[PDB]
């Protein structure tokens, strides 16, 4: 079985690689773009205003081999803020394609 410790190791490397992208990817065409971010789960690129942003299921998941073409989603609003969940400050995401 896929152990906690190996998943944590993979997660750390995912985060490492993401942080490198956050620092090294060129700035977005406009400040109207939604901003790149690591949310502890996935690495998000900058987003075009009024569009959906997609990223692959994080490869550190124990079941990543079962969801090889799955994607997780955010929505970048026309004001360059990531779409938020009501009440909260938290961003809307759809992770359903990456469930076990």
């Amino acid at each position: 079985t896929v152990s906690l410790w190996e998943t944590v190791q993979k997660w750390r490397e995912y985060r490492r690689q993401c942080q490198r992208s956050l620092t090294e990817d060129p700035p977005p065409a406009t400040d109207l773009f939604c901003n790149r971010t690591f949310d502890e789960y996935a690495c998000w690129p900058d987003g075009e205003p009024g569009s959906f942003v997609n990223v692959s299921c994080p490869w550190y998941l124990p079941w990543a081999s079962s969801v090889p073409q799955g994607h997780v989603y955010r929505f970048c609003t026309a004001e360059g803020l990531w779409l938020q969940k009501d009440n909260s400050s938290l961003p809307w995401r759809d992770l359903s394609e990456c469930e076990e």
Binding site: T1, V2, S3, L4, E6, T7, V8, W11, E40, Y41, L61, P62, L95, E100
Partner: peptide, 26 residues
């Protein structure tokens, strides 16, 4: 049927899966 090895495997797998859930929900 279900064996003692199944339950111990399930428990270990669950450790990783809870970590994933801590990542997500938060």
């Amino acid at each position: 049927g279900t064996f003692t090895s199944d339950v111990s495997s399930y428990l270990e797998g669950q450790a990783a899966k809870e970590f994933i859930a801590w990542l997500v929900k938060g």
